[PDB]
């Protein structure tokens, strides 16, 4: 037997796209094994559809869209911009038409409509995953990198998460036209922190990658988290070489291991490179099948886009969609059909180390979370007769420029512990002193936040500096 | 004069082309950008302008040409109110906010703490009710004196 869907699809080009994705090629292949399949399609076919529209004008997608209810279809799929699909679900639910979605755009209290099916996830979720792990972790102070406007409204309830523990954040923008954020990258070079929550695409996560390498703040001290899922397939391994501290996401079971084969088949075919949303088209796929398999026959008839023929059985087959929770390629798929969308989904935590970004552990939203001889840096002030120059027509680098009393103290306490040592200079030229603002300098903020190893000065010992780090005793009296 | 559904763009596809059959110069717009963004492509789309009064959202590679708003920008609003408070000179604060729509208000004053130090509460009315007198028990627990006030 032959049935009929439809597709249409935003792009640069409109109609003069000439290459395809892989989430097209998996389109055609999923039907191509489904049509394989014998408990699955015993005795009907279908005809496809795919039409190429452009970015953003809504009007094309008025066209092409009662242009597919003028022969008549049902695959109802979800274009990259929001108002194309808001207008789809008027239509498609005056017309009454069940409409595929994948992604977010915003939904108000007036989005009181009834005909509309998500896989997408959903953020309140995703941030419960956050507030476990965070509180797993029980960090006190933080910093976002975020995208936009838009991905503070996709995480406006981390925004509100401030009021339930009391770990600091710090909100940052990246540069919204500009991927050389290196000055901003010295803005936070400025600020100096060590773990930071990130929301940013693959490109933005493999372009901030790049430069934290290039930076030089790609060290072991710093952990970070993001929001992304797709950087398996670009090159990820001089970065992790460094020892440096990071876990990942991931919500698809590859453990299961049928999973992993549709992977090494999509490896012929095309690091198994798949988008998410491919495995979201073939479970769009399974489900839509087993809805047909489901309900009884009925007809994809051809009615006018300028009559106002809503379609008899689609409350039947929108009942005949609420039916349906699942067991999925990401695990179980059930929805809370008051909300009737995404809502049930766990995580795949997997943690770095020099080697990789391994497994570590496992969230779901009712449980949460399941699982010497190196050269001292010798920072001193120039004191007489104790830190001073050696002077002399010989050539001198590092120790053997300088002399004095503590030089033989350090050279002493060489003798008994067994360490080599450069000297350095301090920052400003003083003990060291605390503003009123209550920024230390000198040898005391140069060791606090350990831009050297040790301090070697008269160093008056206050009452308030032993509130900072630790005191020896006095050597001097 | 096209009286129709609350968010009701398909009726709109019906009302613009009975607007073409009529034929008209200038275009006005309603208050929904579902419906009215989607007439802003159909205005770009067959070379007439539009009249727009609200804020909505308009990204980058939304990339239209026929259209002047008549509301103020959110960012010059967000700096004005900057300019009270640094007439004002003050550490204490707290945002009483309305929905999603404040933070496109005023993500400069959540950039705000960045460029400027300040001290203020992330709270929002349950929006669904108006009951917030508990939320008011927190708030006089806070006992703040200078709030930030965002609704309609």
């Given at each position: 037997?032959?049935?009929?869907?439809?597709?249409?699809?935003?792009?640069?080009?409109?109609?003069?796209?000439?290459?395809?994705?892989?989430?097209?090629?998996?389109?055609?292949?999923?039907?191509?094994?489904?049509?394989?399949?014998?408990?699955?399609?015993?005795?009907?076919?279908?005809?496809?559809?795919?039409?190429?529209?452009?970015?953003?004008?809504?009007?094309?997608?008025?066209?092409?869209?009662?242009?597919?209810?003028?022969?008549?279809?049902?695959?109802?799929?979800?274009?990259?911009?929001?108002?194309?699909?808001?207008?789809?679900?008027?239509?498609?639910?005056?017309?009454?038409?069940?409409?595929?979605?994948?992604?977010?755009?915003?939904?108000?209290?007036?989005?009181?409509?009834?005909?509309?099916?998500?896989?997408?996830?959903d953020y309140a979720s995703l941030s419960h995953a956050i507030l476990?792990?965070?509180?797993?972790?029980?960090?006190?102070?933080?910093?976002?990198?975020?995208?936009?406007?838009?991905?503070l409204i996709r995480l406006q309830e981390l925004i509100m998460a401030p009021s339930r523990?009391?770990?600091?954040?710090?909100?940052?923008?990246?540069?919204?036209?500009?991927?050389?954020?290196?000055?901003?990258?010295?803005?936070?070079?400025?600020?100096?922190?060590?773990?930071?929550?990130?929301?940013?695409?693959?490109?933005?996560?493999?372009?901030?990658?790049?430069?934290?390498?290039?930076?030089?703040?790609?060290?072991?001290?710093?952990?970070?988290?993001?929001?992304?899922?797709?950087?398996?397939?670009?090159?990820?391994?001089?970065?992790?070489?460094?020892?440096?501290?990071?876990?990942?996401?991931?919500?698809?079971?590859?453990?299961?291991?049928?999973?992993?084969?549709?992977?090494?088949?999509?490896?012929?075919?095309?690091?198994?490179?798949?988008?998410?949303?491919?495995?979201?088209?073939?479970?769009?796929?399974?489900?839509?099948?087993?809805?047909?398999?489901?309900?009884?026959?009925?007809?994809?008839?051809?009615?006018?886009?300028?009559?106002?023929?809503?379609?008899?059985?689609?409350?039947?087959?929108?009942?005949?969609?609420?039916?349906?929770?699942?067991?999925?390629?990401?695990?179980?798929?059930?929805?809370?059909?008051?909300?009737?969308?995404?809502?049930?989904?766990?995580?795949?935590?997997?943690?770095?180390?020099?080697?990789?970004?391994?497994?570590?552990?496992?969230?779901?939203?009712?449980?949460?979370?399941?699982?010497?001889?190196?050269?001292?840096?010798?920072?001193?002030?120039?004191?007489?007769?104790?830190?001073?120059?050696?002077?002399?027509?010989?050539?001198?680098?590092?120790?053997?420029?300088?002399?004095?009393?503590?030089?033989?103290?350090?050279?002493?306490?060489?003798?008994?512990?067994?360490?080599?040592?450069?000297?350095?200079?301090?920052?400003?030229?003083?003990?060291?002193?605390?503003?009123?603002?209550?920024?230390?300098?000198?040898?005391?903020?140069?060791?606090?936040?350990?831009?050297?190893?040790?301090?070697?000065?008269?160093?008056?010992?206050?009452?308030?500096?032993?509130?900072?780090?630790?005191?020896?005793?006095?050597?001097?009296?």
């Open positions: 037997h032959v049935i009929r869907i439809g597709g249409i699809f935003e792009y640069a080009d409109g109609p003069n796209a000439q290459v395809m994705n892989a989430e097209e090629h998996a389109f055609r292949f999923s039907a191509n094994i489904i049509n394989r399949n014998r408990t699955l399609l015993p005795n009907t076919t279908l005809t496809y559809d795919i039409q190429r529209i452009h970015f953003h004008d809504s009007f094309e997608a008025t066209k092409k869209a009662c242009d597919q209810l003028a022969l008549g279809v049902v695959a109802i799929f979800g274009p990259s911009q929001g108002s194309t699909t808001n207008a789809v679900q008027s239509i498609c639910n005056a017309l009454e038409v069940p409409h595929i979605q994948l992604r977010w755009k915003h939904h108000p209290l007036d989005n009181k409509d009834t005909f509309y099916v998500n896989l997408y996830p476990d792990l965070v509180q797993s972790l029980k960090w006190r102070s933080a910093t976002v990198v975020y995208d936009d406007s838009t991905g523990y009391n770990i600091r954040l710090k909100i940052r923008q990246l540069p919204i036209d500009s991927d050389d954020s290196r000055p901003l990258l010295k803005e936070m070079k400025r600020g100096r922190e060590f773990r930071i929550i990130f929301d940013c695409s693959h490109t933005m996560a493999a372009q901030i990658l790049k430069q934290a390498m290039a930076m030089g703040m790609m060290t072991e001290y710093y952990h970070f988290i993001f929001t992304t899922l797709d950087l398996y397939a670009l090159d990820l391994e001089p970065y992790r070489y460094s020892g440096v501290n990071l876990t990942g996401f991931r919500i698809l079971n590859v453990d299961n291991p049928h999973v992993s084969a549709i992977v090494e088949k999509w490896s012929m075919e095309r690091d198994g490179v798949m988008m998410t949303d491919a495995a979201l088209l073939y479970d769009a796929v399974h489900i839509v099948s087993v809805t047909y398999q489901r309900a009884p026959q009925m007809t994809v008839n051809s009615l006018q886009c300028h009559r106002h023929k809503a379609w008899r059985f689609g409350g039947r087959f929108m009942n005949f969609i609420k039916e349906a929770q699942w067991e999925g390629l990401t695990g179980r798929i059930v929805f809370n059909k008051t909300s009737g969308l995404r809502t049930d989904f766990d995580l795949d935590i997997i943690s770095l180390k020099e080697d990789g970004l391994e497994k570590v552990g496992v969230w779901s939203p009712a449980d949460g979370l399941n699982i010497t001889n190196r050269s001292l840096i010798v920072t001193t002030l120039l004191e007489e007769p104790f830190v001073m120059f050696r002077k002399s027509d010989r050539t001198l680098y590092g120790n053997d420029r300088f002399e004095g009393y503590c030089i033989d103290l350090l050279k002493e306490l060489a003798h008994i512990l067994g360490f080599s040592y450069e000297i350095r200079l301090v920052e400003d030229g003083k003990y060291g002193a605390q503003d009123d603002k209550g920024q230390w300098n000198g040898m005391v903020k140069e060791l606090i936040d350990h831009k050297a190893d040790l301090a070697v000065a008269p160093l008056t010992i206050t009452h308030v500096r032993e509130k900072a780090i630790d005191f020896s005793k006095p050597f001097m009296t």
